[PDB]
């Protein structure tokens, strides 16, 4: 299997757990599934890779199923980037 080439959408509000982590529920829109979900957290400038992804190698099984991704953004402003290139879903997050 390879990285998903297509776009992603979010099925529910991003939920902050009691363990200082965030859970994202994603739906794949593109082709080539099953494929690996490209997901990373970037700084305020949308440059350097920050925080971490908790879930092991998240996969999009098809274009109907929902992929549950647990991640840990750093404190303050960050950007959760789901997918590849300019088609990628960018989600602004602020951790208190």
């Amino acid at each position, epitope marked *: 299997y390879t990285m998903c080439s297509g*776009k992603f*959408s*979010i*099925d*529910k*509000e*991003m939920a902050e757990t009691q363990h200082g982590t965030t859970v994202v*529920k994603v*739906k794949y*829109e*593109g082709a080539g599934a099953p494929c690996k979900v490209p997901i990373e957290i970037r700084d305020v400038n949308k440059e350097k890779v920050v925080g971490r992804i908790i879930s092991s190698t998240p996969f999009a099984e*098809n*274009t*109907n*199923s*929902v992929t*549950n991704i647990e991640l840990e953004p750093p404190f303050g402003d960050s*950007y*959760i980037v789901i997918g590849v290139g300019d088609s990628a*879903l*960018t*989600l*602004h*997050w602020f951790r208190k």
Partner: single-chain antibody
Amino acid sequence: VKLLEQSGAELVKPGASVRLSCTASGFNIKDTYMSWVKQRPEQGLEWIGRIDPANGDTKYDPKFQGKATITADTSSNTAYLHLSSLTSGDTAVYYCSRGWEGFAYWGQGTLVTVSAVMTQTPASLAVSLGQRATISCRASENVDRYGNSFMHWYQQKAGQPPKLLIYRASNLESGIPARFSGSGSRTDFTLTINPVEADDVATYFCQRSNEVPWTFGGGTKLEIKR
């Protein structure tokens, strides 16, 4: 495709109560938002409310509070709509739907017969074949969440459920021709159809979903210039 299976038509007397069902397949409802939408004959789409089946949290449009009760059973992967003290005003097609960034999935609709701000412009328009058509949506407040505009566009052809065209203001839904495009940020949004084709004759609706209520615009009927 058709992942949402709705219960059959209801024909009741006033004062009755009904419980409509929506069974999902190909996904677990726990991981989604399940909404119900009302449509009176020849009228616009009205968001009733939504359930988060994971915790049973429900939110309703102020108009439907006291009339509608949405429930969910994660074990049978079914969402329900309870309507109490039914009146002729409740006669409508009721749709169940899945999604937050627009409703990509709709049920077939359930007809319930009781035998007794989002500003969209224009109300209707006509354009010649091959020409550009533009439909506008103005929200009374900003519709951003996580730096993204939660503004969506739908097409609804006569006697059919609506279908998602554009989600998150400018993203083209899979299976939708590239002649459909969305633009805008802040409070003003536009759906562009260019070039217009004969098969584009339908009613178009905008919808916001950043915060509850997930209000639909009043709709715009598109016709071809005679």
